[PDB]
Design a protein around this ligand. Structure first.
Ligand SMILES: O=C(O)/C=C/C(=O)O
Ligand code: NI
Ligand SMILES: [Zn+2]
Length: 345
């Protein structure tokens, strides 16, 4: 993938059964270079039989998204609204005030998004603790993917909501997720259970630093107050602005029943088309560990997520442990290399 483009994969059912194996596989095909990949699951597969039993599930902290800005640069402020049911949310979402506008091609809906971003602030049913997987689904179950990120809980008993536990996201039209990488620059997986699409933008890891340099220049005040201000998840930057400043990026639209995988240090952002529902969590491979060791974290304590790398280095880099503890490990990351578990491919 020398073009670092978003790739799309159609695993067979046999390939689908071993999660870590297939992630290792798509990396052997260069997928990680785009920062983002789509995985379409076998038609046979389904995580839940029916989504009619969820209208009474509570969204404890719905978020009203106020957006301020102009010329492709925006800052998103969160206003927490009182609790709400999935029924209530859908009712608001499908109301005339908040529903999807009519359009022909995607390119048109995208233009309207970037044109009306700051008007009529929508509500996002985001960061809801929970899963919609049926208890017995053993393939790609976001609640229990069984990757080495499990060493965090296994070793320390620590749970970090949304990171090694699942989150649910109820969206409506024009609800957004700002530019960011994952906590500790982990992987993530995102499954769209149902509803209208979710569109994504992505910047290749090998160009991540370019985007940060651009963002620091456009938000000097935020940059001075925090070493990793993009981790606040408040900064929106349109594709025209990226284009204008030569930041490479790709686009992809996610349909219900599809997986998105994001890769270590892959910046991504996007928006929802209308009423929908998504589930996500983080995960790891051996390749992540070095990213974990070098992740630049939020220094102003708004983003509190810090994972101790010690168990990972000890168990998977024993020859570098003493060097690393003494701050003399100057390993340099090559974003093009696949995770070692792909040696088998
Ligand atoms: O569904 C969302 O809000 C996006 C979550 C993610 O960044 O994976
Ligand atoms: Ni993310
Ligand atoms: Zn910060």
């Amino acid at each position: 993938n020398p073009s670092a483009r978003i790739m799309t994969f159609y695993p067979t059912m046999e390939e689908f059964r071993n999660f870590s194996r297939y992630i290792a596989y798509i990396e052997s095909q260069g997928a990680h270079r785009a920062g983002l990949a789509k995985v379409v699951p076998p038609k046979e597969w389904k995580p839940r039989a029916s989504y009619d039993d969820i209208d009474d599930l509570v969204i404890p902290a719905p978020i009203q998204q106020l957006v301020t800005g102009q010329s492709g640069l925006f800052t998103q402020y969160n206003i927490q609204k009182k609790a709400m049911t999935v029924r209530e949310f859908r009712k608001i979402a499908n109301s005339d005030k908040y529903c999807t506008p009519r359009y022909s091609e995607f390119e048109e809906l995208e233009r309207k998004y970037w044109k009306n971003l700051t008007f009529n602030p929508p509500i996002y049913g985001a960061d809801v603790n929970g899963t919609l997987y049926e208890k017995h689904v053993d393939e790609w179950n976001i609640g229990r993917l069984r990757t080495i990120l499990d060493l965090v809980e296994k070793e320390s008993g620590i749970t970090i909501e949304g990171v090694n536990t699942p989150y649910l996201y109820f969206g409506m039209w024009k609800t957004s997720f700002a530019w960011h990488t994952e906590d500790m620059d982990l992987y993530s997986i995102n499954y769209l259970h149902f509803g209208e699409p979710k569109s994504w933008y992505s910047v290749p890891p090998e160009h991540g630093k370019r985007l940060e340099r651009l963002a620091k220049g456009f938000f000097p005040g935020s940059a001075q107050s925090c070493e990793a201000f993009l981790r606040h998840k408040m900064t929106l930057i349109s594709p025209l602005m990226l284009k204008k400043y030569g930041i490479p990026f790709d686009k992809v639209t996610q349909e219900a029943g599809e997986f998105m995988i994001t890769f270590p240090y892959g910046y991504h952002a996007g928006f929802n088309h209308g009423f929908n529902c998504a589930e996500s969590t983080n995960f790891a491979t051996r390749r992540w560990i070095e990213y974990g060791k070098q992740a630049v974290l939020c220094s102003c304590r708004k983003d509190m997520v810090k994972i101790s790398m010690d168990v990972f280095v000890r168990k998977f880099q024993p020859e570098r442990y003493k060097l690393w503890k003494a701050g003399k490990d100057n390993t340099v990351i090559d974003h093009t290399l696949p995770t070692p578990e792909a040696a088998e491919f």
